[PDB]
């Protein structure tokens, strides 16, 4: 099954962290990376002007069950990143999200697939469209149509 994972990071030197996360993803059992998008740049959230986020998408072929893959992405988030001490609840220094898992729809307590907000997020959709331009969502919606219709701004490259 091809899973699509979003990776995000702003902390320390994002290139170094993201590459280490990519290696970890490749090391997940019963799985291999098929392709990785370009690295994209997205401006911080909040007027306070934080570092830029590095964003990318990964296509991972896997024979793991969806919640097994979740275990691994959570483990990698724990091993490769941390919470922000002031904003324990905020995003972690390294974010991994399963956006899609083949054509499966999943609504469990620990896992919601497709990612519940991804159709609203250019920073998820654009890298995905680079590596899967003909992607169709389980509900039948075409990735290309969402980008075209909703007229998202492109992202700059990292």
Curated annotation (Swiss-Prot):
Keywords: ATP-binding, Folate biosynthesis, Kinase, Nucleotide-binding, Transferase
Biochemical pathway: Cofactor biosynthesis; tetrahydrofolate biosynthesis; 2-amino-4-hydroxy-6-hydroxymethyl-7,8-dihydropteridine diphosphate from 7,8-dihydroneopterin triphosphate: step 4/4
Annotated GO MF terms: 2-amino-4-hydroxy-6-hydroxymethyldihydropteridine diphosphokinase activity; ATP binding; kinase activity; magnesium ion binding
InterPro entries, sorted: Hppk, Hppk_sf
GO BP annotations, alphabetical order: folic acid biosynthetic process; tetrahydrofolate biosynthetic process
Enzyme Commission no: 2.7.6.3
Temperature dependence, free-text field: Thermostable. Retains 75% of its activity after heating 30 minutes at 96 degrees Celsius.
Recorded catalytic activity of this chain's protein: 6-hydroxymethyl-7,8-dihydropterin + ATP = (7,8-dihydropterin-6-yl)methyl diphosphate + AMP + H(+)
Disulfide bonds: none
A Pfam family hit: HPPK
Purpose of the protein: Catalyzes the transfer of pyrophosphate from adenosine triphosphate (ATP) to 6-hydroxymethyl-7,8-dihydropterin, an enzymatic step in folate biosynthesis pathway.
Listed NCBIfam families: folK (TIGR01498), PRK10239.1 (NF007595)
Assembly and interaction partners: Monomer.
PANTHER family: 2-AMINO-4-HYDROXY-6-HYDROXYMETHYLDIHYDROPTERIDINE PYROPHOSPHOKINASE
Family from the record: Belongs to the HPPK family.
Protein name, entry field: 2-amino-4-hydroxy-6-hydroxymethyldihydropteridine pyrophosphokinase
Provenance organism: Escherichia coli (strain K12)
């Amino acid at each position: 099954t091809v899973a699509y994972i979003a990776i995000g990071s702003n902390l320390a030197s994002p290139l170094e962290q993201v590459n280490a996360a990519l290696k970890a993803l490749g090391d997940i059992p019963e799985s291999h990376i098929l392709t990785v998008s370009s690295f994209y740049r997205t401006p911080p959230l909040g007027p306070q002007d934080q570092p830029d986020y590095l964003n990318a998408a990964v296509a991972l072929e896997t024979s793991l069950a969806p919640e097994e893959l979740l275990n691994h992405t959570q483990r990698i988030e724990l091993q490769q990143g941390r919470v922000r001490k002031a904003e324990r609840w905020g995003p972690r220094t390294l974010d991994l999200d399963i956006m899609l898992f083949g054509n499966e729809v999943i609504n469990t307590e620990r896992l919601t697939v497709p990612h519940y907000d991804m159709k609203n997020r250019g920073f998820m959709l654009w890298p995905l469209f680079e590596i899967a331009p003909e992607l169709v969502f389980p509900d039948g919606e075409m990735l290309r149509q969402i980008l075209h219709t909703r007229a998202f701004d492109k992202l700059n490259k990292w």
